[PDB]
Design a protein around this motif. Structure first.
Motif, mmCIF file in Angstrom:
data_model
loop_
_atom_site.group_PDB
_atom_site.id
_atom_site.type_symbol
_atom_site.label_atom_id
_atom_site.label_comp_id
_atom_site.label_asym_id
_atom_site.label_seq_id
_atom_site.Cartn_x
_atom_site.Cartn_y
_atom_site.Cartn_z
ATOM 1 N N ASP A 59 0.794 -1.241 0.000
ATOM 2 C CA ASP A 59 0.000 0.000 0.000
ATOM 3 C C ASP A 59 0.829 1.296 0.000
ATOM 4 O O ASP A 59 2.038 1.268 -0.216
ATOM 5 N N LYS A 60 0.161 2.426 0.246
ATOM 6 C CA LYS A 60 0.816 3.731 0.272
ATOM 7 C C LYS A 60 1.870 3.860 1.383
ATOM 8 O O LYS A 60 2.907 4.498 1.198
ATOM 9 N N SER A 70 3.592 1.346 2.661
ATOM 10 C CA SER A 70 4.594 0.294 2.565
ATOM 11 C C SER A 70 5.992 0.797 2.238
ATOM 12 O O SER A 70 6.956 0.383 2.880
ATOM 13 N N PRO A 71 6.114 1.672 1.221
ATOM 14 C CA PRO A 71 7.449 2.184 0.896
ATOM 15 C C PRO A 71 7.943 3.050 2.035
ATOM 16 O O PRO A 71 9.148 3.168 2.258
ATOM 17 N N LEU A 72 7.001 3.631 2.772
ATOM 18 C CA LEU A 72 7.343 4.461 3.916
ATOM 19 C C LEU A 72 7.872 3.610 5.055
ATOM 20 O O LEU A 72 8.913 3.930 5.632
ATOM 21 N N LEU A 127 9.302 0.767 5.047
ATOM 22 C CA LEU A 127 10.656 0.325 4.746
ATOM 23 C C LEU A 127 11.620 1.457 5.051
ATOM 24 O O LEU A 127 12.637 1.256 5.715
ATOM 25 N N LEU A 133 12.063 1.325 8.573
ATOM 26 C CA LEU A 133 12.859 0.188 9.005
ATOM 27 C C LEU A 133 14.343 0.451 8.738
ATOM 28 O O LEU A 133 15.161 0.426 9.656
#
Lengths: 147, 143, 147, 143, 147, 143
Positions: E63-64, E66-68, E70, E73
């Motif tokens: 989702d929106k 998700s890249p965030l 990571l 992380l």
């Protein structure tokens, strides 16, 4: 259908499976004809050549015997006779006893209570001797536990 | 399905009358009276010279069972364990199309369990494999 | 449907899969068109970078080849060519051969017979070389076994 | 579903014509001719600084396959592995909504098996993640 | 039906789940009412007495956020608040929020992307503290992470 | 099904109002308001004198949950954990037919997971087993 029924007589407790397959003991599960046994819904056992016997392992549901069997286990009480009677649908379409497994001087080595017949209970016996008999065809054989 | 015969040094045909009404109740099927039905099989050879593994077969509780459990606790040398495999022929008929024969097999493990089953392991001295319809065969000493 | 068919030629035995997919050999399983091959119902293989090849692993049913393959295995017989032919339903609705895997100078390293097509048999080959070809699109590639 | 493109240093577009009739037979679906279909994915990052794991993808046997198996046995540095993920849009239409792009990825393992599948593992130098419709993104060097 | 929804506020990124459960972000999965959260389709956590907390483990789809996440992380970014809101069908037949789990000063310790809602993603948080509240019956309790 | 009551030294009846509408929403079923429903159980004793294992029970998230998680992080000694098991009687009616009671049990592990479940482990000082309809019973100190 093809269930086993069992009887236990303990040196201390007498017939442990007495009145154990009855309305009171099993409830809606009750079928007449085996009132002084327990309904075995599991079985596992193994003898190997590395002879070495492995504990006999049955499965039942919670019942009248169950609190007794624990007493047995935690007491270290020698079981004079555990006798497992095997049932099948005969060639003529009627249920019959056709095999027997029998422990002499057995000891209950562990019990596990778990919910999955949803209320379950596996019991393990060691023993000094076990006898396997085929009841229709007349073959039989026995042996002494090793190890 | 498969049917197995076992002749031992002490007992003779251990599987005599083992696939009859008396032995297996309702499951009886005429034609293989002196054979135990096998509905499970496991066996392996792996490679420097080859080594063998035990042949494992699964059967139900029957007349042979106590004899078998004896054959194991006694240590009796099985002169012959013979497994004949059947299939539906191209013409639509049950036919015996394969055999796996062990010579001087020994029972080294038996597992009973629950409908009411029982596994048998044999080691042996010689195994033969033959394809009955295509006429091919091989065999090998245990190692 | 999307099965593979295989051929084996052994240095000692010649074409080991000869007449091996036939009524006699497979019985009711027989379909015409692959009489000198075997019906492969399994496949596993892996090349890794810790290159290191892993044995090729196929699965078949009991058949005319089977007693031969064991002879091969227990004899240590070098397989001049094992060749696995892959089949699929084409875009026009017809079955086609579209991929090939091929071993050169392979050796059978183990066999397992087991009953589950109920009569089964997995066979493992090592090899000096393996070639993968795509048959419709024309891509190909090969390599030498390592380790 | 997902579609992947791989450009390598030696071969160029390894996935050229890889999702066509010639390549994948009946499974063909126009619109992604130079992409291999990916129907399985696995990848992980875990935490003191982060370390990366290989991206694993599962594909079927196709025109790319032998090229891929070459890319692995050669050691060829993959300039670009690009995975575009599709979903059904809120309006009821297939839309490309996500990308996972690896730079200088390497194939470190391939597993073929049987309908006819094949797993590919890449390590790499840089991975990017972007959400195409919501406009978010991140990336990270391998470690 | 009985899903959880979550919010993340990162010290660096602000509200990470902002506009993350929307048509744009989730596509056909979108249901109104939780636009600034993420749809949690998994959950695992455990506290034990050898107290010792284990990382909190949720599952979502790509989702929106998700890249965030990571970025979070791989950046080692402290999460000011992760707050998991639990939903169920009430006794009167309406969906209700009835439980809350909340992390303070959490850190994302690993992510796994995998395809099985076919596009999936598990995320793990450690944290300095977690609070469990029952929202209808008013019970609550909290604790500090150990180990 | 089973229903469990837990009285602790600090909190009293931890399961008070735990099987009500407020607590478990639509799943509510009158008659066991001060009991948490148990739909999973695990426990074992093994044999030279016997040793005990923890009783594991599985429940859903409810009003008791945060109290329970407190009981564990505090170390509070559970005066009584009582599990009453129900079955359909031979006459066709739900009846309480078994009890497993722990004295001075302690919570040594809790696992929450997702419909929304939660496992509880207790060690203890004394367990009792009683069959309510057949009138048999036993008990044993933990070891």
């Amino acid at each position: 259908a093809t269930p086993a029924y069992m009887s236990i007589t303990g040196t201390k407790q007498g017939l442990i499976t007495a009145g154990a397959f009855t309305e009171d003991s099993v409830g809606n599960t009750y079928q007449e004809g085996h009132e002084d046994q327990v309904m075995v819904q599991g079985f596992n056992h193994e003898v190997i050549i590395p002879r070495v016997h492995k504990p006999v392992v049955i499965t039942k549901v919670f019942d009248k015997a169950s609190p007794l069997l624990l007493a047995a286990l935690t007491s270290g009480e020698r079981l004079t006779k555990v006798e497992i009677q095997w049932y099948r649908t005969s060639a003529a379409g009627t249920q019959e006893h056709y095999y027997t497994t029998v422990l002499e001087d057995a000891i209950i080595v562990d019990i596990k209570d778990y919910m999955h017949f949803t209320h379950l209970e596996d019991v393990h016996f060691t023993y000094r001797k076990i006898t396997w008999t085929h009841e229709v065809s007349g073959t039989s054989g026995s042996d002494d536990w090793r190890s």
